[PDB]
Design a binder for this molecule. Structure first.
Ligand SMILES: COc1ccccc1CNC(N)=O
Lengths: 300, 237
């Protein structure tokens, strides 16, 4: 179990750690989050009390370094940093633990939510979508745009998601225009799976990372990416059976975890109705269809 | 974006454009079978591709062989149309290729966009106008060439005959749309109007009769009467 200590909490802030959130008051004696499970990526995220504009946070894996948070009063945000002096870090974390100035990751012994939301997400891939190589962790916020969005303006602060575009030459073989547009199996399996992602795990990892950025930061381009990646599978007549089965499990926990009151902006009526009721895979997403219909029947 | 009443005069500027209509591409007669079920039999069709500024018509005849062994013909027809328009554009010299292609039905937008991905600079546009190009098979010489065709064939016409010698494209297109709208509302009356006078003939190289200017004004008036009429006869007004 790992720890992200905080130097202090100078400004009133709602802190989020995975699907968990807590309230920290201005200058409350707060020094971090302990008992973070090893073996998964994590996201620590922030919404200031005074300006709910800009949710923001950091994707990190404790196996890759000792990380802490320190408010910066100049840039006005909680910044993640790496401590290279390991002895200094252990000493700091132990003191804060002894003084019980760290809140606890409440991981229940029946709860597999985070695992099922991050199953194929890897930090190495996150760091290639979020390009900032000098840090082992990755900053994301509400306002960052995607590469594709920038095509349709700062490239250093972009989300370099894989560009998916159904009316592109990449997506449509010359001479198979109607075939390839109505049955995207070529684009899914040859262009994307075999060509770009190399395997289904990487494809699912970006999909899951796109959803989480959509959910935690309300990042709109992430939501676009998440829906495009779903649609490209649902609109493919030929998809490996294991991908379909895993997809259903993936979407199930995403729909399960979405806040009830955010469904209206995070869920695209057209893609979901198409995917669940018109597409080739309309009958292959049993779990996902059942929870969608029992929880958000309005969108459908 | 969409072509409508407010940007109507863009049709007659000097940027090359084509209207495409796919209404007559896939055509069937519906009949009973010996067992009393219903079946369709396709008849020859055509793509109606028209430069509204010049009158040039690119009549691509769709022979019923193109449907043999195919499923979902109404959907295929939209893509067959897009394949043929794309081939037409590629066949033309660069300085003759259109800058815009306006489709008369929105279901052609995606088929044509995909077939034209090689031509990113050609705008594929819908329209809100209800254009009467479906009535193009009411023009005898056009229907005749479609029905006689034994293989795929492109035939080239000027749908304005020689009108541009005496009137502007805007007027030539108003006349064409009025003739076609009449032929669509009541083909028999329309054709009656157009032929009633045996001294006014259609030249071998033309589609419509050789009316003088004065005679076109009478004809045009008679076509508007017919259109207002059938509208009453329809709505009882
Ligand atoms: C680390 O999660 C916490 C920290 C401090 C107080 C409460 C929680 C748990 N929140 C939650 N939503 O379950």
């Amino acid at each position: 179990m790992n720890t992200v200590p905080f130097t202090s909490a100078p400004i009133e802030v709602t802190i989020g750690i995975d699907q968990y959130s807590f309230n920290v008051k201005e200058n409350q004696p707060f020094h971090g989050i302990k008992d973070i499970p090893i073996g998964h990526v994590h996201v620590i995220h922030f919404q200031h009390a005074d300006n709910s504009s800009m949710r923001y946070g950091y994707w990190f894996d404790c196996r890759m370094g000792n990380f802490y948070i320190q408010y910066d009063p100049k840039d006005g945000l909680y910044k993640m940093m790496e401590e290279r002096d390991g002895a200094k870090f252990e000493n700091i974390v132990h003191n804060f633990k002894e003084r019980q100035m760290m809140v606890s990751y409440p991981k229940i012994d029946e709860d597999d939510t985070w695992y099922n939301l991050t199953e194929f997400v890897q930090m190495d891939k996150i760091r290639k979508i979020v390009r900032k190589d000098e840090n082992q962790f990755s900053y994301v916020d509400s306002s960052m745009t995607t590469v594709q969005e920038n095509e349709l303006s700062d490239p250093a602060h972009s989300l370099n998601y894989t560009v998916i575009n159904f009316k592109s030459r990449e997506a449509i073989r010359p001479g198979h225009e109607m075939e390839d547009f109505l049955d995207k199996s070529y684009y899914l399996n040859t262009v994307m799976l075999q060509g770009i992602f190399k395997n289904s795990s990487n494809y699912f990892g970006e999909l899951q990372f796109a959803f989480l950025n959509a959910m935690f930061f309300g990042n709109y381009g992430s939501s676009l990416q998440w829906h495009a990646m779903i649609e490209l599978i649902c609109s493919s007549a030929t998809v490996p059976k294991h991908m379909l089965d895993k997809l259903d499990e993936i979407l199930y926990y995403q729909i399960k975890t979405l806040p009830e009151q955010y469904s209206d902006i995070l869920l695209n009526e057209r893609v979901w109705n198409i995917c669940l009721y018109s597409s080739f895979q309309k009958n292959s997403l049993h779990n996902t269809e059942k929870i969608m219909e029992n929880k958000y029947p309005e969108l459908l | 974006g969409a072509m409508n009443s407010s940007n109507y005069a863009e049709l007659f500027n000097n940027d090359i454009k084509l209207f495409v209509d796919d209404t007559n591409v896939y055509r069937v007669t519906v009949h009973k079978t010996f067992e009393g079920n219903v079946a369709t039999k396709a008849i020859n069709g055509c793509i109606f591709t028209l430069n509204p500024k010049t009158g040039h018509l690119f009549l691509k005849i769709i022979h019923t062989s193109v449907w043999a062994g195919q499923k979902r013909l109404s959907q295929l027809a939209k893509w067959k149309t897009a394949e043929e328009v794309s081939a037409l554009v590629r066949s033309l010299p660069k300085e003759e290729q259109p800058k815009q292609i306006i489709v008369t039905r929105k279901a052609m937008l995606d088929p044509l966009e995909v077939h034209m991905l090689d031509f990113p600079n050609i705008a594929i546009r819908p329209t809100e106008l209800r254009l009467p190009f479906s009535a193009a098979m009411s023009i005898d010489k056009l229907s005749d060439v479609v029905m006689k065709a034994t293989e795929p064939q492109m035939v080239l016409f000027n749908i304005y005959d020689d009108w541009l010698d005496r009137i502007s494209s805007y007027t030539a297109f108003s006349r064409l749309t009025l003739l076609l709208r009449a032929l669509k509302t009541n083909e028999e009356s329309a054709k009656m109007i157009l032929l009633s006078d045996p001294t006014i003939t259609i030249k071998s190289y033309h589609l419509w009769p050789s009316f003088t200017d004065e005679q076109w004004i009478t004809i045009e008036s008679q076509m508007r009467d017919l259109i207002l009429t059938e509208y009453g006869r329809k709505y009882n007004v």
